[PDB]
Coordinates of C-alpha atoms and ligand atoms in Angstrom, one line a residue:
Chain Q
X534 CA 0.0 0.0 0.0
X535 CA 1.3 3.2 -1.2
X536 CA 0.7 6.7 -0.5
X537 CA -1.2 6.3 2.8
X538 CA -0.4 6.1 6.1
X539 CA 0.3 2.6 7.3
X540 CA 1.9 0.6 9.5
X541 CA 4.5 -1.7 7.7
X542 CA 7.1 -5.0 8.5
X543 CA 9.5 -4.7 5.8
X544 CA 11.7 -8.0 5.9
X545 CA 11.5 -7.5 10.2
X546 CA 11.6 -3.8 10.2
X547 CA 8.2 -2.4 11.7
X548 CA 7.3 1.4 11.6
X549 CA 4.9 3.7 10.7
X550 CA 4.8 6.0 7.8
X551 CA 3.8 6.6 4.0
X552 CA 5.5 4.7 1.6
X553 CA 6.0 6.3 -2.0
X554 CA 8.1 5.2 -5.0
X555 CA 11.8 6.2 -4.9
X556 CA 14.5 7.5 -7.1
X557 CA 16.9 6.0 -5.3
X558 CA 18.5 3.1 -7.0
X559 CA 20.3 1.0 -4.0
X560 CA 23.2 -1.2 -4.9
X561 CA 22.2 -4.9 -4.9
X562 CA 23.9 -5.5 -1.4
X563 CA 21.7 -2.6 -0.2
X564 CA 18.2 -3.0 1.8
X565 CA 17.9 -0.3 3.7
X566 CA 18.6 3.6 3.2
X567 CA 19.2 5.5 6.6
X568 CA 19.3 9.5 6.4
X569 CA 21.8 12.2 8.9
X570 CA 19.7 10.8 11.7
X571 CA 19.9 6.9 11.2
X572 CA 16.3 6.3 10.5
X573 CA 15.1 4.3 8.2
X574 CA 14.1 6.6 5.3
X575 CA 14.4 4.3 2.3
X576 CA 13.5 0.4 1.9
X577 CA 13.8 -2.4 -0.7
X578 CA 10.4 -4.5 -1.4
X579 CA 12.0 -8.0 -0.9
X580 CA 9.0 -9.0 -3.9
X581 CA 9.0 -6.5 -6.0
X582 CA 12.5 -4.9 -5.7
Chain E
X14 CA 54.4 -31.5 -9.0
X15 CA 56.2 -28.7 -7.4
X16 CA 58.0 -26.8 -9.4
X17 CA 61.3 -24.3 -7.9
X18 CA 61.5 -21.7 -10.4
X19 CA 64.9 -20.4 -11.5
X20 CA 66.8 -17.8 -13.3
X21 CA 65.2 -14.8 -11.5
X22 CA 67.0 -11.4 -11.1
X23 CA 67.7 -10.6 -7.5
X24 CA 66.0 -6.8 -7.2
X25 CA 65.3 -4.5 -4.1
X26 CA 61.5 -4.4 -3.1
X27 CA 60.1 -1.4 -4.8
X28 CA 57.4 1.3 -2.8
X29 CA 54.9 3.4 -3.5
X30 CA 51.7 5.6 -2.0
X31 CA 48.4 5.1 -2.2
X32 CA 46.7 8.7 -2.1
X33 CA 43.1 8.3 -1.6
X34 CA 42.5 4.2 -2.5
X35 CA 41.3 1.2 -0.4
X36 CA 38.2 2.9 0.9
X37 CA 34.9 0.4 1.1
X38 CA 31.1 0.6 2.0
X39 CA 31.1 0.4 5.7
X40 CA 27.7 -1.6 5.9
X41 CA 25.1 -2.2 3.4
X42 CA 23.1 0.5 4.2
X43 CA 21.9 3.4 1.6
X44 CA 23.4 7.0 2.5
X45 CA 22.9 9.5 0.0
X46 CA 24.0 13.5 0.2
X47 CA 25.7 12.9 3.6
X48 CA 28.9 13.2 5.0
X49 CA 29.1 10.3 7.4
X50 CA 31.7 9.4 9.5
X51 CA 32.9 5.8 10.7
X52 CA 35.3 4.0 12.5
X53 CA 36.4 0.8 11.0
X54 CA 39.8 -1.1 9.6
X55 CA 40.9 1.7 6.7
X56 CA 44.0 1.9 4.4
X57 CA 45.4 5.3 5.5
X58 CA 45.6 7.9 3.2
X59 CA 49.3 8.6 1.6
X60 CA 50.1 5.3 3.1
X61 CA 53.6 3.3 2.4
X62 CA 52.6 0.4 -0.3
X63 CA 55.1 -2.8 -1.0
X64 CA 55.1 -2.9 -4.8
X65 CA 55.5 -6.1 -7.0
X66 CA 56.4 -6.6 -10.1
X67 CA 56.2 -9.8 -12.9
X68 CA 58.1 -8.7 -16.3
X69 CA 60.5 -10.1 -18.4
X70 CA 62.7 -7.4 -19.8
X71 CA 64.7 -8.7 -23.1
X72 CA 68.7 -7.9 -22.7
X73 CA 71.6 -9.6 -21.6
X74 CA 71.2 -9.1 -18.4
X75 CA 67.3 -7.8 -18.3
X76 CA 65.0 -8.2 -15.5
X77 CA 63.3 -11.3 -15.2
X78 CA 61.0 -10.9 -11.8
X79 CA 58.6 -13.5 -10.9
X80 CA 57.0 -11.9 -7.2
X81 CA 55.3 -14.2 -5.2
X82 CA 56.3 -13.2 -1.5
X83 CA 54.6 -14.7 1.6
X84 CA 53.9 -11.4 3.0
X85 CA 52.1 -10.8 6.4
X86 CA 48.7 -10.5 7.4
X87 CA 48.3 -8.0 10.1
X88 CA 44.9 -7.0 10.5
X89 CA 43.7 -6.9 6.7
X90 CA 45.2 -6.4 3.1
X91 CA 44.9 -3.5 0.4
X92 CA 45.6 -5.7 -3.0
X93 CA 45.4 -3.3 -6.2
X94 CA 46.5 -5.6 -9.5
X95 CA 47.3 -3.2 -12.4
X96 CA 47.4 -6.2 -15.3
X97 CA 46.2 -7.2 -18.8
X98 CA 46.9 -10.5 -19.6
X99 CA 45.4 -12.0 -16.1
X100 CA 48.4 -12.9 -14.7
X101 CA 47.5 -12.5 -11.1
X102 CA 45.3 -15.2 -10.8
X103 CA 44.4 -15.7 -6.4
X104 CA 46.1 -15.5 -2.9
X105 CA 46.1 -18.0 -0.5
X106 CA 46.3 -17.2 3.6
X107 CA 47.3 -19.2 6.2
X108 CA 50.0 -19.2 9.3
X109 CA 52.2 -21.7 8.6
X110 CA 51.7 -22.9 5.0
X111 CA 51.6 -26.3 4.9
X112 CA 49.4 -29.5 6.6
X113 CA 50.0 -28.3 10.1
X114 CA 47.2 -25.6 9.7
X115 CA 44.3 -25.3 7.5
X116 CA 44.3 -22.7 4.9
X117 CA 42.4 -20.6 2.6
X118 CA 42.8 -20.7 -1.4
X119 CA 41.2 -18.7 -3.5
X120 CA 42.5 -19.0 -7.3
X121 CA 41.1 -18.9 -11.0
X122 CA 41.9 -22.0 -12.7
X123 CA 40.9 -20.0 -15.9
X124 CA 37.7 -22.1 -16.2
X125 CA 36.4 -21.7 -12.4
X126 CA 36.9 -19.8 -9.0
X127 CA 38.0 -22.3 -6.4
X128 CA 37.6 -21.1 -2.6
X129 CA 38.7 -24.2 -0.3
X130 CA 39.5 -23.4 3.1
X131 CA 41.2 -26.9 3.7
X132 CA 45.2 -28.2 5.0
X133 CA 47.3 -27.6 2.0
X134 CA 50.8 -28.9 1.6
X135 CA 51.8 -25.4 -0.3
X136 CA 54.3 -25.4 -3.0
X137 CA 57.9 -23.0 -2.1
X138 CA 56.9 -21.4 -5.6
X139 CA 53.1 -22.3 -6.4
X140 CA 51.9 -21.0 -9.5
X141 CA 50.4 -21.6 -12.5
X142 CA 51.3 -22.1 -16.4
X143 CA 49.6 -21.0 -19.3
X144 CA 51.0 -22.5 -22.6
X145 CA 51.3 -20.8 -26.3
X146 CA 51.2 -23.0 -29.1
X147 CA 52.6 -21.8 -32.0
X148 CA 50.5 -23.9 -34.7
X149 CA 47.0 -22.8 -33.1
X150 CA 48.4 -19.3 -32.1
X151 CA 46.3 -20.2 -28.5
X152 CA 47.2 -20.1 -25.2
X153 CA 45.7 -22.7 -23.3
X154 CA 46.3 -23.3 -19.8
X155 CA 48.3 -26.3 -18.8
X156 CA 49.7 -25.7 -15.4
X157 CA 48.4 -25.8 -11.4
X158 CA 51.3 -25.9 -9.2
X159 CA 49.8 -24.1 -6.3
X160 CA 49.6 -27.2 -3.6
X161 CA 50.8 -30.5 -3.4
X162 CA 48.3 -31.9 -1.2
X163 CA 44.8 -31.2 0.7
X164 CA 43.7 -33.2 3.1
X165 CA 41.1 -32.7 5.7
X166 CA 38.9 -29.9 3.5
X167 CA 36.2 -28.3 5.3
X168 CA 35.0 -25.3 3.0
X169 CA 34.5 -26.0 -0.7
X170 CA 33.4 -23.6 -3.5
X171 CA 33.5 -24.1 -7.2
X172 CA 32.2 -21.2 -9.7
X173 CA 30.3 -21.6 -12.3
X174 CA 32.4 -22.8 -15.7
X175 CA 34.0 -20.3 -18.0
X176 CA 36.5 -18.9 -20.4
X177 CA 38.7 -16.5 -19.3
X178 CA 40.9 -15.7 -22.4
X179 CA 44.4 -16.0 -21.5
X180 CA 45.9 -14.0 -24.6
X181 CA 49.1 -12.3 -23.5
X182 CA 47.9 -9.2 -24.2
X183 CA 51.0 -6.6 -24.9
X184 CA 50.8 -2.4 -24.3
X185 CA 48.7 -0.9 -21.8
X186 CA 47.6 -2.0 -18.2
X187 CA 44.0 -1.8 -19.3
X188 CA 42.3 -3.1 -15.7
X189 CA 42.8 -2.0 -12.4
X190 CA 41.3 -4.4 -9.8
X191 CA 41.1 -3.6 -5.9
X192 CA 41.0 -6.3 -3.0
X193 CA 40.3 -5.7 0.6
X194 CA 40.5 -8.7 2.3
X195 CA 39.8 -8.6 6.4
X196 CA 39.5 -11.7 9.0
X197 CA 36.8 -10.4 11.7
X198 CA 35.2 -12.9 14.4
X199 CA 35.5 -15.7 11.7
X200 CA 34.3 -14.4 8.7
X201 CA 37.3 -14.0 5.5
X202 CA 35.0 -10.2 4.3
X203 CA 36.0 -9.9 0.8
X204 CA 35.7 -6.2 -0.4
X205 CA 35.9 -5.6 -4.9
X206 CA 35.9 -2.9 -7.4
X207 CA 37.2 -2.7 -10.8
X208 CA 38.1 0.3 -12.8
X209 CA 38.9 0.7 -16.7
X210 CA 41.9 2.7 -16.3
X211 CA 45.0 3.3 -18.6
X212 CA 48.8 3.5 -17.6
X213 CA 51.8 1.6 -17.9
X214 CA 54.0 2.8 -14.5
X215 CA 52.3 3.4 -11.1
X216 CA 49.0 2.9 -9.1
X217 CA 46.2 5.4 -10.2
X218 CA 45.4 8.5 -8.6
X219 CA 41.8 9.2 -8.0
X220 CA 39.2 7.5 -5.7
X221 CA 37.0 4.5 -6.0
X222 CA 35.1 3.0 -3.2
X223 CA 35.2 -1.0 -2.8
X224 CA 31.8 -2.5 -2.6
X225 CA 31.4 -5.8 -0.5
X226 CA 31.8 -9.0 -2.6
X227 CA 31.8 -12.2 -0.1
X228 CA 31.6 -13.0 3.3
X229 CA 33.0 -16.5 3.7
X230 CA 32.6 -18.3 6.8
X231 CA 35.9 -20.2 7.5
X232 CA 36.8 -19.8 10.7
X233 CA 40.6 -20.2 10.6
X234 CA 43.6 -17.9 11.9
X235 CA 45.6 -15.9 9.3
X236 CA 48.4 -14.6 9.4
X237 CA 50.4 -14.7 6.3
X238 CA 49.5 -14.5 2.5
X239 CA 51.0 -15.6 -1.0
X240 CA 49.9 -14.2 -4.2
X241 CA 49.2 -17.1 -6.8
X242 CA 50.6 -15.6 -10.3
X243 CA 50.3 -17.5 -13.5
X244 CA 53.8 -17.5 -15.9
X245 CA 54.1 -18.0 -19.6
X246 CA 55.4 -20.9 -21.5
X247 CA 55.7 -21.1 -25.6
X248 CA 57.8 -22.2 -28.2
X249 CA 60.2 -19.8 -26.9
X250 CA 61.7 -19.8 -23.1
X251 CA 63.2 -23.4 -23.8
X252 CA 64.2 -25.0 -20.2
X253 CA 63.5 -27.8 -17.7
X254 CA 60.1 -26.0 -16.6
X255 CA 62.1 -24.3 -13.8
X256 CA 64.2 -21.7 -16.0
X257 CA 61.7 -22.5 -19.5
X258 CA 58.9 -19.6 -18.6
X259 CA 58.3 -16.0 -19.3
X260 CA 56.2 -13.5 -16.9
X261 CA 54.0 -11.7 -18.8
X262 CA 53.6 -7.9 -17.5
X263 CA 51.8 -7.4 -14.5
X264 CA 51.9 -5.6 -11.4
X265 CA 50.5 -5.8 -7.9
X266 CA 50.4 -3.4 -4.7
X267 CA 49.7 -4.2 -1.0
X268 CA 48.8 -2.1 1.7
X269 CA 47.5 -2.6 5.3
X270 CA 44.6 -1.5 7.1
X271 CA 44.7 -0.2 10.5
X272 CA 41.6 1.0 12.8
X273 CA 40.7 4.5 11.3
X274 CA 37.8 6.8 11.6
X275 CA 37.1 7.9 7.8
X276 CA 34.7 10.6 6.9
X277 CA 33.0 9.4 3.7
X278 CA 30.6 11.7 1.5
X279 CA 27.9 10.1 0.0
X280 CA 26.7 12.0 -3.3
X281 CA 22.9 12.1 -4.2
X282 CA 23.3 9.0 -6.2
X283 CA 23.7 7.0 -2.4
X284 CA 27.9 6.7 -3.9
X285 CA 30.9 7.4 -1.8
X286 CA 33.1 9.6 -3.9
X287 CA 35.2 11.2 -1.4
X288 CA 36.9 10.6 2.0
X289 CA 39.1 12.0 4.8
X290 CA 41.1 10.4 6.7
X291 CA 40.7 12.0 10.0
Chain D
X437 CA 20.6 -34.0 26.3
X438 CA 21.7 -36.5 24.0
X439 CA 22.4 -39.5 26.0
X440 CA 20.2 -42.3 24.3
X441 CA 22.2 -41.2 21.3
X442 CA 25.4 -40.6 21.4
X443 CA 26.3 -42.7 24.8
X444 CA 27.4 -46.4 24.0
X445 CA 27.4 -49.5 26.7
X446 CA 31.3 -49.8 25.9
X447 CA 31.7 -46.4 25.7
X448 CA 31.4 -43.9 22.6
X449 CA 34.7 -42.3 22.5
X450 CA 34.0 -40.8 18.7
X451 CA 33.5 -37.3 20.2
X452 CA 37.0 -35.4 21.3
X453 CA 37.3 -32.4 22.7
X454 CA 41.2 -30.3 22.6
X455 CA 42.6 -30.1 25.8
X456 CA 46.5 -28.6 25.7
X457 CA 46.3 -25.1 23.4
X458 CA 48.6 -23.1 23.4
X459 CA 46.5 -20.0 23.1
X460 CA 42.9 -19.4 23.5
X461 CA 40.9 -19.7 20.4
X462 CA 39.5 -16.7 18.5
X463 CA 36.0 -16.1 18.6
X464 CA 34.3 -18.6 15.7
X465 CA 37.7 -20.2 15.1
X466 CA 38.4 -23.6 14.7
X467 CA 41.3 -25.6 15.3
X468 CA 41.9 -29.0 14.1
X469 CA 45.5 -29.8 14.4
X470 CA 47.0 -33.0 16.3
X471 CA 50.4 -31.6 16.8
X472 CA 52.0 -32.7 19.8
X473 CA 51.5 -30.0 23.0
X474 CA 54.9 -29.4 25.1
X475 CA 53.9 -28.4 28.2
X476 CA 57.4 -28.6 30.1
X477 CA 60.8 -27.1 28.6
X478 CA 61.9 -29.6 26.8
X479 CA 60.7 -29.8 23.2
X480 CA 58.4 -32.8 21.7
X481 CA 59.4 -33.7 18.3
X482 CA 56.2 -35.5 17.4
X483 CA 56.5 -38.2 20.2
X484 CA 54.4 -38.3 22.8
X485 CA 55.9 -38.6 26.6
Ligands
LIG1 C1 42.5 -34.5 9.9 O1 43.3 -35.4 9.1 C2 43.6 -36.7 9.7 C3 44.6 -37.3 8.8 O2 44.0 -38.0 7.7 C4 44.8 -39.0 7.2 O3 46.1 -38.5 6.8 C5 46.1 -37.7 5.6 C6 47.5 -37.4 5.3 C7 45.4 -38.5 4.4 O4 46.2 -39.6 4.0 C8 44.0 -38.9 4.9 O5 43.4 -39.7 3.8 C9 44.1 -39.8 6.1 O6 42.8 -40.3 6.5 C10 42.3 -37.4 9.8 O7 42.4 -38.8 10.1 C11 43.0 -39.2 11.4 O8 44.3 -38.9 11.6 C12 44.8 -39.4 12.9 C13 46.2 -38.9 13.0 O9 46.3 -37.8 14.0 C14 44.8 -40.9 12.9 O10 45.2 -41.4 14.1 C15 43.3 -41.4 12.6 O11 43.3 -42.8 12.5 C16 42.8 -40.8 11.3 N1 41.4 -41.1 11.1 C17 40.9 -41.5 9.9 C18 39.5 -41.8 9.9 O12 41.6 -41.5 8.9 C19 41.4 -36.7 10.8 O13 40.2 -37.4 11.0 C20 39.5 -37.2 12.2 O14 40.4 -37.0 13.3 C21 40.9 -38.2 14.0 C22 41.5 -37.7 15.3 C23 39.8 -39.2 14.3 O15 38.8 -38.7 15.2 C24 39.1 -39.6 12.9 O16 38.1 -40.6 13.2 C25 38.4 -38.3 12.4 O17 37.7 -38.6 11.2 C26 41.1 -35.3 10.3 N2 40.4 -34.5 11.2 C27 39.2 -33.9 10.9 C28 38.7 -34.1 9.5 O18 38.6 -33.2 11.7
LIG2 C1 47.5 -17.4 14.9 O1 48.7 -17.8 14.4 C2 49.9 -17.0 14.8 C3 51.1 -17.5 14.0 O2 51.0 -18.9 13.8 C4 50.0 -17.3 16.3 O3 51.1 -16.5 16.8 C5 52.1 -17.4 17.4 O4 51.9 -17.7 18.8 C6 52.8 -18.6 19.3 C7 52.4 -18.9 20.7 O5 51.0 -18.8 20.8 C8 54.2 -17.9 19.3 O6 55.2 -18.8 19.8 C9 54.6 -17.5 17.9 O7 55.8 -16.7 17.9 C10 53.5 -16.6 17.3 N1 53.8 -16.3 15.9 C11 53.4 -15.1 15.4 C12 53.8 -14.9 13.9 O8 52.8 -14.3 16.0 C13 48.7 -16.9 17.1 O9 48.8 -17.3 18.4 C14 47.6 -17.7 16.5 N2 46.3 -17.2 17.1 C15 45.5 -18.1 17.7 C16 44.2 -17.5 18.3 O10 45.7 -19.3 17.7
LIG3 C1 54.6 -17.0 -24.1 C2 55.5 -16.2 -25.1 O1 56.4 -16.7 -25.5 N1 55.1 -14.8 -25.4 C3 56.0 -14.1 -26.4 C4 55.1 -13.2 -27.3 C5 54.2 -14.0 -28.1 O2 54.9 -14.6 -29.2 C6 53.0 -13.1 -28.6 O3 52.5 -12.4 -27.6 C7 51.9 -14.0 -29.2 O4 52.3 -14.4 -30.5 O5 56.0 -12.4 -28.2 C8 57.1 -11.6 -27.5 O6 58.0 -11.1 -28.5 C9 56.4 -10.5 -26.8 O7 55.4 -9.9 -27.3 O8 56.9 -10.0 -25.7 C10 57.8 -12.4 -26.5 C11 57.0 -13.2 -25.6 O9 57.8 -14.2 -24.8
LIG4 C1 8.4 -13.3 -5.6 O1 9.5 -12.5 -5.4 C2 10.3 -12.3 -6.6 C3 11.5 -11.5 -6.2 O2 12.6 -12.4 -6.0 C4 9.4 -11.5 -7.6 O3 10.1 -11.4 -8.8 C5 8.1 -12.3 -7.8 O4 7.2 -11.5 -8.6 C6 7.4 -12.6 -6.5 N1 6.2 -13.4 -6.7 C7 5.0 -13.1 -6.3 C8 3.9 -14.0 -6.6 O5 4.8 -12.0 -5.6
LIG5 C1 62.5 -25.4 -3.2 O1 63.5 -24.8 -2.4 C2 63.3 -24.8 -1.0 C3 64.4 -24.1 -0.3 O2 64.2 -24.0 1.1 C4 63.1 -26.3 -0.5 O3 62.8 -26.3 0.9 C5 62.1 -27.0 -1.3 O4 62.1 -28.4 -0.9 C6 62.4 -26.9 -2.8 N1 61.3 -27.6 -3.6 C7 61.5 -28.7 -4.3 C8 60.3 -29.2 -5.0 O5 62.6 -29.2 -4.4
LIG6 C1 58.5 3.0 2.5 O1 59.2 2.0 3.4 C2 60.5 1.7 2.9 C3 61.1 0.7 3.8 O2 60.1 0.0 4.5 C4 61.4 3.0 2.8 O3 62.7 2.6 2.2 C5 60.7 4.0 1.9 O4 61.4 5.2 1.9 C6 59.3 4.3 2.4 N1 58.6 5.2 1.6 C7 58.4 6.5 1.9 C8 57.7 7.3 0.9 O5 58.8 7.0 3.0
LIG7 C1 40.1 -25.8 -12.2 O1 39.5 -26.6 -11.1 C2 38.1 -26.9 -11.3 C3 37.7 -27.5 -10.0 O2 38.7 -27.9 -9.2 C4 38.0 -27.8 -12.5 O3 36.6 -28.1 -12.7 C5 38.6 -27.2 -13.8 O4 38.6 -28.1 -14.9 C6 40.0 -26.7 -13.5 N1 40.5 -26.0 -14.6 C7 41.7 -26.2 -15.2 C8 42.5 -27.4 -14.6 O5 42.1 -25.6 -16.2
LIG8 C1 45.3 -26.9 -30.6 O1 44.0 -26.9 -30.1 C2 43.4 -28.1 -29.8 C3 42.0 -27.9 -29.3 O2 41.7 -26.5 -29.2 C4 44.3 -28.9 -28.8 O3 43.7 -30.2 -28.6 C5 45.7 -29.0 -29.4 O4 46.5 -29.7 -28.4 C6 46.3 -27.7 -29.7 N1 47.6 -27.8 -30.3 C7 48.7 -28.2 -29.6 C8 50.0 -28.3 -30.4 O5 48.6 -28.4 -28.4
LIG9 C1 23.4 10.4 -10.5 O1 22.8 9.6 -11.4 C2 22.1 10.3 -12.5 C3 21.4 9.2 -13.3 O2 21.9 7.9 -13.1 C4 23.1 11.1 -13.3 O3 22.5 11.8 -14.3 C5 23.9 12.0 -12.4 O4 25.0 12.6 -13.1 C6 24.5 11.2 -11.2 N1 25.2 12.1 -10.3 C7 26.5 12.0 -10.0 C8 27.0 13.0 -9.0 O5 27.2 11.1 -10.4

């Protein structure tokens, strides 16, 4: 579910927050992005990568 | 089927700096447009690099260096190969090299990667021999001399199959290919990155951070490493497969790591293109 | 607890154990050699005694 607020268990990883598409492009060893204060800002869909 | 090689020019080891080089991703998280700093084992900046060297100068005299040195393993190794013909073909680590201990081999047969973590009876001078046939114009490879026996193998990996041209390539170093290799609670972390580059002389200058490769789970205590090279044999070089062999050009650089914090900028693209050594 | 299958009426001496290191082991490091341990000053050369 995207553009809403939802709760979400990505691979583990529970929070809270909107998910919306990215332009980041992670490097294939990458699953997480973390931003200046080390949350979790940026995620991988372990199905639809 | 160990072979002692021969006819090798006695030379003084050669040194040079790495500027900026040896830097690696940290973890495998995404950072981009942030200037993050970390504390981890780092090849210092400027740092004092051994340098080797495998040519075959024509003369009288010449040069005729073949450098395969057990070298120390203090807490992790820098390994830059500037080559062209693939003549640095693995490393293996260890602390006493030979069946007393177990050791770790990780080589390119020119058809597969082997990894075995296992107790090798290592060769004085292991290599391996890649033939030129004059009526085909191929090279083909026809020698592993790298171990003489393995007994009591615990870790086994085989790539998948394939080719590899070993064409003794002449001009140019046309691939630069960096190594950081760390033992850490267990776990051999394998760090890679290639780069096109173009030079015949000395390291490159620039920056290029490492991105993590492998994480093997061997388990063994290392202390000392051997690069595995692969010589030249043809129609010329006539011998008794100890003075018979050329080295085609190739050169290889190894620095240490040591516990450094590094401030690494990550661009917008989530790359780290710059670093400071604190 | 593994008694009804790795204990023998004899005796199941097929599990060994290292006693004798020179050094403590590394975290997740495994040793497997059988070299001979000298524990006194005078040095073993592979005999046992
Ligand atoms: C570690 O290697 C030992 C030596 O293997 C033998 O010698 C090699 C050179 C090669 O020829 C190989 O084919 C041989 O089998 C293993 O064998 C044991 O070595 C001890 C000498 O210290 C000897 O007394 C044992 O009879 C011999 N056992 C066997 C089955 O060959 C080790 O095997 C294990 O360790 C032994 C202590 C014993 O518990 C044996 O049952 C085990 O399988 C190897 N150790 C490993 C693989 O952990
Ligand atoms: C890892 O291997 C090194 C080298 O084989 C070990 O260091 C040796 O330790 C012995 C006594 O423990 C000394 O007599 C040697 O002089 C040491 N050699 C070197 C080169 O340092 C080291 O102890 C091993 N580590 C573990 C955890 O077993
Ligand atoms: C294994 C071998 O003998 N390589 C020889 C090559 C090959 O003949 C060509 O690369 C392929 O034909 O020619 C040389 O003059 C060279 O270029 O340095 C000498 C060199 O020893
Ligand atoms: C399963 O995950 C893979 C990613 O590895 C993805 O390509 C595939 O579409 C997924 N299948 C389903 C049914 O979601
Ligand atoms: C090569 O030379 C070394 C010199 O110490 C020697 O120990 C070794 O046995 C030699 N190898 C062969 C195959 O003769
Ligand atoms: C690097 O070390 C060698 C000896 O270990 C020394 O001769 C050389 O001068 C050093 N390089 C620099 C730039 O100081
Ligand atoms: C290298 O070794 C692998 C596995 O040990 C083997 O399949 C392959 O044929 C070898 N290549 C050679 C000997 O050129
Ligand atoms: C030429 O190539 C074939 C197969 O590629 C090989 O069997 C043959 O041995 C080569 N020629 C020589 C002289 O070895
Ligand atoms: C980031 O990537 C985009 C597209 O891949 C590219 O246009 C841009 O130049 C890159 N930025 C940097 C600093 O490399």
């Amino acid at each position: 579910v995207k553009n809403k607020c939802v709760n979400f268990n990505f691979n583990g990883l529970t929070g809270t927050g909107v998910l919306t598409e990215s332009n980041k492009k992670f490097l294939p060893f990458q699953q997480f992005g973390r931003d200046i204060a080390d949350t979790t800002d940026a995620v991988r869909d372990p199905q639809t990568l | 089927q160990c072979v002692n090689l021969t006819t090798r020019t006695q030379l003084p080891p050669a040194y040079t700096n790495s500027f900026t080089r040896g830097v690696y991703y940290p973890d495998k998280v995404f950072r981009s447009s942030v200037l993050h700093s970390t504390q981890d084992l780092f090849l210092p900046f400027f740092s004092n690099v051994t340098w080797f060297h495998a040519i075959h100068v024509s003369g009288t005299n010449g040069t005729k260096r073949f450098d395969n040195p057990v070298l120390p393993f203090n807490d992790g190794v820098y390994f830059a190969s500037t080559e062209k013909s693939n003549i640095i073909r693995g490393w293996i680590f260890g602390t006493t090299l030979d069946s007393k201990t177990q050791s770790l081999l990780i080589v390119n047969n020119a058809t597969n990667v082997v990894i075995k973590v296992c107790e090798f009876q290592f060769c004085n001078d292991p290599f391996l021999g890649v033939y030129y046939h004059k009526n085909n114009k191929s090279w083909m490879e026809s020698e592993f001399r790298v171990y003489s026996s393995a007994n009591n193998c615990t870790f086994e990996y085989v790539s998948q199959p394939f080719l590899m041209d070993l064409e003794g390539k002449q001009g140019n170093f046309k691939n630069l290919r960096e190594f950081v290799f760390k033992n850490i609670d267990g776990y051999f972390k394998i760090y890679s990155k290639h780069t096109p580059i173009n030079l015949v002389r000395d390291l490159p200058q620039g920056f290029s951070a490492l991105e993590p490769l492998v994480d093997l789970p061997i388990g063994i205590n290392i202390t000392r490493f051997q690069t595995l090279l692969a010589l030249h044999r043809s129609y010329l070089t006539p011998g008794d497969s100890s003075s018979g062999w050329t080295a085609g050009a190739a050169a290889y650089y190894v620095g240490y790591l040591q516990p450094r914090t590094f401030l690494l900028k990550y661009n917008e693209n989530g790359t780290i293109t710059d670093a400071v050594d604190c | 607890n593994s008694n009804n299958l790795d204990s023998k009426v004899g005796g199941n001496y097929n599990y060994l154990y290292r006693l004798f290191r020179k050094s403590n082991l590394k975290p997740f490091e495994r040793d497997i050699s059988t070299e001979i341990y000298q524990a006194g000053s005078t040095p073993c050369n592979g005999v046992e005694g």
